Amino acid sequence: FNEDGSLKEVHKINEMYAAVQEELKSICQKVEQSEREVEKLLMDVNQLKEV
Amino acid sequence: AVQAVHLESDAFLVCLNHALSTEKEEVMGLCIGELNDDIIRIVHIHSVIILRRSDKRKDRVEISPEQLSAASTEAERLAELTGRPMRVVGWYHSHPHITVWPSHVDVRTQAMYQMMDQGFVGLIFSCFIEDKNTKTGRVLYTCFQSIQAQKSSEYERIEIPIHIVPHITIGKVCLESAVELPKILCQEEQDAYRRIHSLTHLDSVTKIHNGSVFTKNLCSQMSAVSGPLLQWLEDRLEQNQQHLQELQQEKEELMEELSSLE
Amino acid sequence: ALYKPQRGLFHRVPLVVTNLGMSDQLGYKTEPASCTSTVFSRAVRTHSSQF
């Protein structure tokens, strides 16, 4: 039960969830960057096809 | 006054994934966009904001002016970040195991929001529909507004044409909005648990029971939401890598075809 | 039956007996929630040792 209330499971699981949340944040950032690169390359290809 | 609504698939995906998050209750959110003119008045919806519903219960879906203030803040932030003239233009909610059409309560709420601004439109997503006879699944959506009845009684429904604009790639706003689902679910569980822990006059064995319940709830959240969401993002990164390789090959091919001609 | 005074007359009051049956609600999820996620597996595995 730990001291001053709280529970050990509560904090362990909250920290595990925070770790998974940060993993998702990192993967979200990098996938967003990949989407930006795809937009750039696709605009280039379509403009060249128009020409 | 309003004549049509265009919704960027970029936000349609967030709406649908929010609707498919749970079948046991109705969920809600707001729709950000702009006004546009032709010939015809149209609303272009670019992004959405996911909301946590406090009242819950069946058919009782309403938005607090607090969430309206949050939505106007998000609208200003996105208008300055993107340089677009973005305002809060609509709302959406989910009807799991329930007809796609709006209820009298949905229409009265749409009228209560139109009293704020006649430019406001409503969306509805009909989720998990079961039919063991056909063994077929369905998912539906509709857009609507409200108008005073034929005689001087009370508001009635009216349909608005809605189309989906192909946004070839996912916008940063929509990814940053879609990753809010696990965070909002975890915050909901945490707030429920904090309201449980507020009653200091409480048994210890009861606190152990509640801790076990909290642990199993977050385990379910991770098994059903965070895990599949992360897996989908990994698979999409693989798809994006392959697509970038193919498009780079095609760009080099077209560059070689066109460059030597001069 | 339970009785309590109200209007000088005594009226019956409901009685319930607490028992284990009151929402023990055994769950135990079977069938693995297996994911092809490298990041999810890595995080769960890193923080498994913790409890």
Ligand SMILES: [Zn+2]
């Ligand atoms: Zn409704």
